[PDB]
């Protein structure tokens, strides 16, 4: 199942 695209970038750790 192809995961949905992000709405916006995740933050770095």
């Amino acid at each position, epitope marked *: 199942p192809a*995961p*949905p*695209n*992000a*709405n*916006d*970038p*995740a*933050p*770095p*750790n």
Partner: antibody
Amino acid sequence: YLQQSGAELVRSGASVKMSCKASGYTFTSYNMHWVKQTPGQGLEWIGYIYPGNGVTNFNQKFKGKATLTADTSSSTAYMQISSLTSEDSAVYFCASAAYWGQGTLVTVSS
Amino acid sequence: DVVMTQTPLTLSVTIGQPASISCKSSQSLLYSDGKTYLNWLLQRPGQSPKRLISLVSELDSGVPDRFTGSGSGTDFTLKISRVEAEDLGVYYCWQGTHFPRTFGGGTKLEIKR
């Protein structure tokens, strides 16, 4: 799928805490956003939490008022808003990946 | 903040008519990973929003192929090839590149019958 908690009546100056339970996608892989819908149906971004590492980022307007947390063991996100005033009566949504919650209505009134 | 200007304010369309909605951002939405984080949403009357399109042009699962998204940089368009009755509601664009995240003002699509 995002399931939000029920509507709230809260007094001016008090706080409210609402929840958003996630299923059917990887909770920890996407920012969890909270969004206020204004009476004229504009949408206003409050902030997000990234449940993979807890990092939050906020709209400057809500800094010092909003607190965002995320429980990865139960895949639930929480938003607290403190010091409520009349302008905080609104529907609040959570949103993450392709999904939106159904909204939580908050009425600020004594 | 990056302003998202959506036009028109209202679309009054008949069933089968094409429709298009424009979203212009006040700054480029190209992010440093090479992606452009421009999403389109539909909120039908009485419901929560639903995402239709992400990354400018990529349809979400279940969205009819009558919908297409295009654009780059600051100028974006959502097109409906032929409107159906269930397409009514308010469409919003929203950008995920800049802080704060921001939304367009909405376009209300109403059906003439």
